[PDB]
Amino acid sequence: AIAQLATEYVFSDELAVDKMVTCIAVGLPLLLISLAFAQEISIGTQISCFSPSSFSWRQAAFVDSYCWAAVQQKNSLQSESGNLPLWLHKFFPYILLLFAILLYLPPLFWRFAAAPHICSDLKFIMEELDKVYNRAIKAAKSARDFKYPIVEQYLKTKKNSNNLIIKYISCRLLTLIIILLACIYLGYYFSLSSLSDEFVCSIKSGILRNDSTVPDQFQCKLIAVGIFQLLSVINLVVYVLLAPVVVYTLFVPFRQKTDVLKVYEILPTFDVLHFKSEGYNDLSLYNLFLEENISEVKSYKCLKVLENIKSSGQGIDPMLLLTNL
Amino acid sequence: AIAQLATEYVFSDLRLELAVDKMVTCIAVGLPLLLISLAFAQEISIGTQISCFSPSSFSWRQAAFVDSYCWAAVQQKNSLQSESGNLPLWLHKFFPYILLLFAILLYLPPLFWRFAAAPHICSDLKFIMEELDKVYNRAIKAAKSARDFKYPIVEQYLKTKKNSNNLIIKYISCRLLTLIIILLACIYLGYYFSLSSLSDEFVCSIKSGILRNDSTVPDQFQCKLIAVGIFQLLSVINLVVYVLLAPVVVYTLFVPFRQKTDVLKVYEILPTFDVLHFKSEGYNDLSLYNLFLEENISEVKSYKCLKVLENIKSSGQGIDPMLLLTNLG
Amino acid sequence: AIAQLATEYVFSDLRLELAVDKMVTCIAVGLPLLLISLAFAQEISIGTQISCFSPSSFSWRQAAFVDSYCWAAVQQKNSLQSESGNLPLWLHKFFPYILLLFAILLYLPPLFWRFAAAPHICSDLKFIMEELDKVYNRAIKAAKSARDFKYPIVEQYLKTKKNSNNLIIKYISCRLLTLIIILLACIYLGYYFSLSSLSDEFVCSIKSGILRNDSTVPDQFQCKLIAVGIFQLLSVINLVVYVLLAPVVVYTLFVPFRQKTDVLKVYEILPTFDVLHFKSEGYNDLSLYNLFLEENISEVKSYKCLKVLENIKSSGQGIDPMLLLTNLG
Amino acid sequence: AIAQLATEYVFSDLELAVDKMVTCIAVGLPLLLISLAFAQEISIGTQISCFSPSSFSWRQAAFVDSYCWAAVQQKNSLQSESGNLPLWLHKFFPYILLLFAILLYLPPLFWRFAAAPHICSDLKFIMEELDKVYNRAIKAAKSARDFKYPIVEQYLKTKKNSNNLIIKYISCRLLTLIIILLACIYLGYYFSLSSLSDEFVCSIKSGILRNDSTVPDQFQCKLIAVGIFQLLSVINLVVYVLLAPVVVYTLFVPFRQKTDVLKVYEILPTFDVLHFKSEGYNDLSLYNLFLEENISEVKSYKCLKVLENIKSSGQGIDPMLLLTNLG
Amino acid sequence: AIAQLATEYVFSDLRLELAVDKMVTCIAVGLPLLLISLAFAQEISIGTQISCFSPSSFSWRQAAFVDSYCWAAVQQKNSLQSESGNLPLWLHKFFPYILLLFAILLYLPPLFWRFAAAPHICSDLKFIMEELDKVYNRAIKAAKSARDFKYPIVEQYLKTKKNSNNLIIKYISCRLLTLIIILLACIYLGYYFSLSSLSDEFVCSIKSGILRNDSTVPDQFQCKLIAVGIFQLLSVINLVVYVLLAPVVVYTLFVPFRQKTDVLKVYEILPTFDVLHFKSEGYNDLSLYNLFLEENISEVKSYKCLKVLENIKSSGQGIDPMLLLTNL
Amino acid sequence: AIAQLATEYVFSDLAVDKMVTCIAVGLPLLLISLAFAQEISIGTQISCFSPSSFSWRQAAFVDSYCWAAVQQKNSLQSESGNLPLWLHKFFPYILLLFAILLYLPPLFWRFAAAPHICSDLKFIMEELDKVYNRAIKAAKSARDFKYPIVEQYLKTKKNSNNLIIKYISCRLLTLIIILLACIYLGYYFSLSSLSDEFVCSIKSGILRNDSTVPDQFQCKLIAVGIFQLLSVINLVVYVLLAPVVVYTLFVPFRQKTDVLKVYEILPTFDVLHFKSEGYNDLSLYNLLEENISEVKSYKCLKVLENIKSSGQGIDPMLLLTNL
């Protein structure tokens, strides 16, 4: 596992919450699976059974392989808990890989989805706030010497449409279902007695059915089941911690706060209306991304400064505003 | 599987191709290759194709000769005695190779499309985008002059593409051959799953040449095709993937049933753009170009301004050219 | 392979050559190359290509020596006694190498082309492109002045190219040598496939030198040329690919029939452009240059505008000079 | 190793620098240690051996080594004086190391994602205001040689109220220090292990191997490379015992802040001669920290520094020196 | 072999050298290199290069020691009992190394012509190219003004190069060294293939040191040079390729014969250019200069224009001054 | 060594501090990699001759138990002591740690030094080029402010020593690590090279009262000689590299050939070099003179200085000729 080391070295020298969730739900299982087959620890193939010393070297290899393949054929298997334990033991990494790919899916669905209207409208609302700020500045400057609620009308329009909000909520909900299923499964793969590996096999079929030099049966054990157990426990912890994060992300209206337009509501060139709260609509998601990327607008910083000044109350809107420039 | 690890790590931290179709190609091409790689994992695939449990009296190199001779004898159908038939063994020896072949066959349509079908539609999209930007600019300049040629060229090219069917035929052909390949490989794989899983534990006896009359040789060897259950579970997964992708491929095939909002309606509020969208209901490049417009319309910011105007008109607050002047695009 | 497929997967997420010929080179190079790669696949290549089932009394390293000596003896024809003959031994002992040599031979003609005649075609294409753009500019300026030299230069270049076949000779020669290569390789591969499939299970007796009158040696060992089955499957695959590819090469050879839909008439709607395309049945560099112009005609914006105008004139909605001024090129 | 070799070869060929180096060490030391733990030269082979009787077959002994090595999970089964806990720790020592390493690496990412953008934007804005103020002052001095509101100072007073970013940075550093504490505790614990668990008795006598007779009772089963783990863990423990006070001093926000840059802007008539930015658990302090950090990025900051150093000599008049600057 | 496989796959995904010579160097480089890489192909390479079937009494490591001892004993000519001699075995061992040496020797003269004779070539090229461009521009401006100095500069440079025989000597030398190289290498290749192919099997007797009087040792071991037939087949392929390439080398040597299709004659229709082809085969650096002029003259747009005008004058329907004015 | 060979082949087809860092980083890394090479690593670390009666895997367990016993001081029987066994066990690891430690100060210093040095250099270059252009304009006007700003910044850095202190600290910790690792390397070589031939007796646990086991096996620590030769090579490399850092230490003494003099002949520049004899950032910043080639105007000033060196022409006349 030197490739992960190099990934960190180049590390050394979409909502942020969703980005972090993707990061966790991606690395934890992927890094886990890479760790399981890590060359230093990937020593051993989990077929050990010590067939009688009379069995030749290659005879022993055949025993090991025939059992390892017989993990599927239930009739060949003589197990206490059942074959499905053995199945889980064999595909445990493959199962982890499938779960992880499934979890990475929804973010990819969003990425190729790109939330087209959402990103374009983000750029649009940015340009609109910028133009409104420039217009207010020029108006105050002339005072020292159209008019349609464009962004406000766009917001009213978003107040009807929730299609993108439906997309966001569906992505989050698919994420939650994924992690819930994976956590249940991973606890199940940790719900093992951990005794299933040491099971008994007898490859006495074919010409080996009536063969005599063969022993009655072989006791093989599935190694690294303890390792698989430990890694499943780690991933289960990670996901039992991650699920509340997905839950909190699911409550977007409960999260949409700290009105950014509140400062721009002090603008005469802007409609005096926050009008952004309490809705299962793309208004909420657009407002969330607006709070997310709102620092990117220099005028947003200026508006925060003016809002603080009004909180300072030393100056008035017009004088200090025109002074801002 | 360090390849997928690095892919995800970098994943951690014009279109000229349909997003649905791009993702379908991506999945249906990788998932088979992905499964093949995951099985070709030496940690997963450590041993040979099949062991034989030869007599202990046989030498280690003798055991190797037995193993290899049977594993090669899977081809000679007369060589081994199996109830299922030779085709099972053949499939088992060629399961990964056949998987790779199907994957290459699936990669072929996107490649051919990009080589031949794509560039012309790309140039067409570029021309349409230039026409749209120029028309929006001209309408905005007229609106500005009011606040202070004339040939429907883009509409003409649209009416022409309404006759043009070649490109639509090419796209539909790529998608259809794709779906056909998906169905064929799906049947093949499901049959590969249909394998009773008993062929693996077959019997071979290499008694050719002097080994025909050999004495120290036993009667025969019990060889067991390893990774038979592995290949079968992979076949199940791949068949699932393909039975799920096929409906997506079919819906992608339906161009008239794509049922996309008329992007021209956003430019239909232009004075400089005649009021006629008329882009649907034809087994021609008409519908395909309409779909590509619905696709790459985000690449045109003027399309974004038109959509903003459309939303404003949905609010019904103001008048159209006055709002255009208010936009000053 | 593992990493070959990994790079292939991460690949996803002026023509100066015949696109058809480009794809032909691609297939005819990849099929053998990917096949040879499979011949060195870890899952496919299980180990050495020979196994001999020596007596168990023979020591381990003794068994290795026997295997190797028989393997080298596949060349020494008097040593190995096979009912088929030595030539099969030659073949399925160097079949991969032979495939690689054939693939290199197949990549040779396109390399010689791209090195020798390709820059000539690039210069000719750039020159014709400049000529067409200049004609479009002059026509647009004259149409605008109406709204307010003249020598057949491109036509002269066309008449000149209509005489010489030198570049056409080069292109046809590359294609024809390629086709000969395809036919020879196909015959070869079919031959190698058309093998007993049993000759591999030959018998060797390395009783040379002191081993001639040696006693502990068996009279002979029944040795097997492993992987012959997979070699045969791969040869069949490649032969099928080539039987599918050859007619494409033939169609490439037929250049006149390949020459179709001359765009010289898409500029013939210009008065400052000759009304005589004179662009058919030219068994000379004419045909090749015209084909490459048909290929890269999309790159010229004026070609796009002229195509729009040609469609409009087919649609019959606008006068030629009026619509020309309206497009305002 | 090899990837490490390439990293060193290219080596041979906005975030707090102290924090950057802290994260860098806290990542590389365990990562490099783990990589060495699988070094082809260092890692010599399997981690467990028990010298089963020669009567046991080769592959038989292989099965023994394997089943024993796995039996470490089987708590009741194994025969050790220390218990299943130390052998367990050795069973996944590198796993624990990697968990701790990724855990330590997370908070820097959370920072470089959450507090990074706001601080970056605010710093760009403050530097831009500084540059515009310097331009305005030089221009006014030039015109004399022939608004006026504390805008950036207003933003400073504003940040002096909010401590949200300060809270984020402090929490990042604090969680990181907590990780260092717990990890160093664990590491010393693992090294504290008496190197006795390595050698112990293993008896894979379960099932038909329980009532099997050809099997001996047990083997003397030797966990391997435990000494290597001990030495590298000691190295890491020393590294982290050295690093923890660095994290502490980093957590010292009012004390790390020194030499207020605002004095350089305090040489301005057009910009208030007032730092008024220190001594507070507010985002003001961290903003001042980053101002001191990337103030070298501001060329006008360099001009102010040279001018202030000259005025320390007292050579020329401040307006005269400004006019001579002609920046 | 997946390295070169992916290399050629992504292959599918000024000149300062003669195209013919470029192809010669390319082939003469790849064929031996490709063969060598084939020799170390894991599918192709079966394993160790020698095997001798020591008695089963000899232990495993004993057998390995025998194999290696003989393998090195191919050098000690007395220790090896060879009817053909030791030099065959010598050739067998370094056979790849021999091919690698031949390959490096094949790549050297291309490198010499690459860096050496880069300055003169590029200088003459850029200079004569700018000169032709200026002559075309001047003739065009002259026709435009007439319808409305005087020094044969590049012609003078050609006259000067007529005396020059330095770069001509260098090119001839690069070709000649290459020809000698390929000739000697092909002689060697046949000689290697000339070998009996039964010499590959030879007897070794490791009775040195305490093995001189050792007892458990047999008298000898009969060991075989493995994969010698493969080296033989490779030498066959290389010998065929080089017997094919050598005549191409000779053709490249014949520079004056190859010098054809006078381009300055196409420039001889220029007013600002004197009527002097000045293209005579001789022991002059101009011939190669003329050769590369023919090579990269396609890079000259005005060359294409002049060729068009030349076809027009061959049509004989347009006046040279009138058509020149028409050129625009 | 295929990767490094390809790297040098594609290579084939304070600067002093940079080179010292490069060498002192690669030589240990190069040597450790050389040992890491399996071509050099012809065998496992210890192959130690158990009895033939011991099974293959039994011998494996012996080699493993002894190789682990290289730490357990009671377990092994050696005259030289355990510390030899320790050193031999982690000699590669020791090399790697020393190399990382030696690469650290370059990273830390360059990090600290990057902004300060680059900004001061850019500002000084701007000031010098401005004074040069101004003198050129004055000469051109004669053919037809007044503050020593760069001189002020120079005198300022002549006061502050913090950055020079940082440079000295980087160099000093560097020399300290060099000396420590050099003594260590000679020491590991100083080893009598006899410890490898130690005996181990794995009679622990049931092996205490086990009987089929021999009392012990005389086991050998392999690659001791290779590691020793590597230590000798690296130690000589460091004994050669250290006096370079030593000369670097006397940097004020090392400061020579004042570059400011060529700028001192300007009219727009006061005739005063004033750059020597200080434990301050002055000489450090002067070590300016390092990358001073980037200023074409500096090249012109040097040319004018060389012209006046012969005394052939007047300074302003030839200066205006230069323009």
Ligand SMILES: CC1(C)[C@@H](OC(=O)CCC(=O)O)CC[C@]2(C)[C@H]3C(=O)C=C4[C@@H]5C[C@@](C)(C(=O)O)CC[C@]5(C)CC[C@@]4(C)[C@]3(C)CC[C@@H]12
């Ligand atoms: C090289 C490796 C280790 C291995 O190679 C690998 O798997 C990779 C690791 C490596 O290459 O070292 C392949 C198996 C093998 C070649 C192996 C073999 O074939 C058969 C035996 C026999 C087993 C035995 C005791 C019996 O089984 O009764 C009878 C005596 C005898 C001859 C002892 C030695 C070994 C164990 C022998 C020759 C030692 C070398 C060994």
